[PDB]
Amino acid sequence: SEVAHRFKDLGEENFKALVLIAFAQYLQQCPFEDHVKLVNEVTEFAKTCVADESAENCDKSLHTLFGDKLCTVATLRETYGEMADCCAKQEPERNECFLQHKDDNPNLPRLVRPEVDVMCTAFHDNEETFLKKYLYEIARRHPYFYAPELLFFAKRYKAAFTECCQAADKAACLLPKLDELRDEGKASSAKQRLKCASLQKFGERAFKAWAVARLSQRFPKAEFAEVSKLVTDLTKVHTECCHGDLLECADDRADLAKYICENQDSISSKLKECCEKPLLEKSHCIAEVENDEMPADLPSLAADFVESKDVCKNYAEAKDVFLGMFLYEYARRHPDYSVVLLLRLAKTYETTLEKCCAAADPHECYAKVFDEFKPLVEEPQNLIKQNCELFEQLGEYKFQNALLVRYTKKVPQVSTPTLVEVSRNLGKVGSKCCKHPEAKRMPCAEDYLSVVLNQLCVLHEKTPVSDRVTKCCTESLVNRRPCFSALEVDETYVPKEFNAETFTFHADICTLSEKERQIKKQTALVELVKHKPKATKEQLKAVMDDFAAFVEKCCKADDKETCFAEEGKKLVAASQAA
């Protein structure tokens, strides 16, 4: 019995919560009530298997069980659409099918926190139903959310309301704390979507090379064997989470934290505070703790990998082992390099070792390897440096605007809302990284730009409209950022004609908050670029501020919502003819 095994290992609480997530990630449109009932029935069924493990259905797989249950609500499909297709199959084809229909951009109401008092009301009226609400609503919008990690956000959510609902100022305690988990959640989500896109699109080998490079950077005093044991455990975990095997994912993550903490002196000296923490806090802490000190007496890389005469020899004996070794060795020496740069280095290392060990003289040609590594290292360096000056010059909002212009011209066929969600997230790179010294930027900046770009890939993949996004997204996971960066103004694209709809907005704008008031201005800024990409110097910004003045001036003109309609049809024609 699988469900009884997981039940025992995870505890009732976590079993419930993890099962709710799985369902919300597979049936995103389905009502909250339906999912909660279904979960209760599964839990009810689980308890019986824990009692007598030979009870009728207790030897079926978790997907068999969980899919049969989901399917009691899915297999009708007027509003559900195409998810009764998956219910006409048997496992393991059904799970493939559910997975395949995960929606990165579900048409769901874009989510708005009600007042603090009403929330404390519900939190105290029934605290269970309130917290299940948070899981359901985050999970169904983030169907790849790292499920063990979603339980931690859930615990911190609960503690916020526990502390703040007993405050003299419920709002001041709770606004900052809920603002934190919101931002932290989105970031958490975007990262996890990259881990799954790698496993799902590029295959486990590609993911193995990622964690080898990351854990080596983080645990550089650890031996290779050790680093490898960890990469193997960590790969499995994420494979299971990304393939909807969430109970086993959570169980294995806990095992891995437990092992890590029981082999600390073999891994790192920065693990003290993490391993003294309640179990969800623990895995979170481990997953993202500061890199350890780099050992003193490391010999030059070049000796084992370039100067040595046994390279082609040793390479051949075990290529994947030798290449991981290289990656291990190059990474632990460079916590100042982005992960994707380390992976670019190891690919170049690989293809050089491939042609040189065939040709006339191995020793001679592969000795040059390090000059092939040169340009690859400096291209990110100059970019992160160049884009951080710009940020300090312009500040965040204008830094976002600049990249919007940049990216719109890059890939003008892309949906305007997407460009807007992507360019803003790209622009967040400045406040996040530039802060740091130059020896900590590149990983901060480039691996984050990898994540945001991945977001552009998945949103576009839904309905492809741009050949260049497809190419840049399908080619090499690791070379995506150089790819997009390399793109210039698209000349094939023929501009969009304006019309009496794309801009003529209403009076609700004034009551909107700073942020939404920015996004609308940014949405219009994209359309101005789509409609005339070329001549777009300061003539863009001279019109964008004429929208800004227009909005502000017309907002505060005591008008019965009429100045907008009147003075709005004007400036579209005016900003066109300009």
Ligand SMILES: CC(=O)Nc1nc(C)c(-c2cnc(F)c(NS(=O)(=O)c3sc(C)nc3C)c2)s1
């Ligand atoms: C129609 C409707 O009522 N939808 C909503 N359902 C839930 C559970 C909402 C919600 C409840 N409590 C919060 F506290 C936040 N906080 S938040 O919006 O800022 C957060 S927190 C987080 C991890 N993501 C977001 C978007 C959001 S709003």
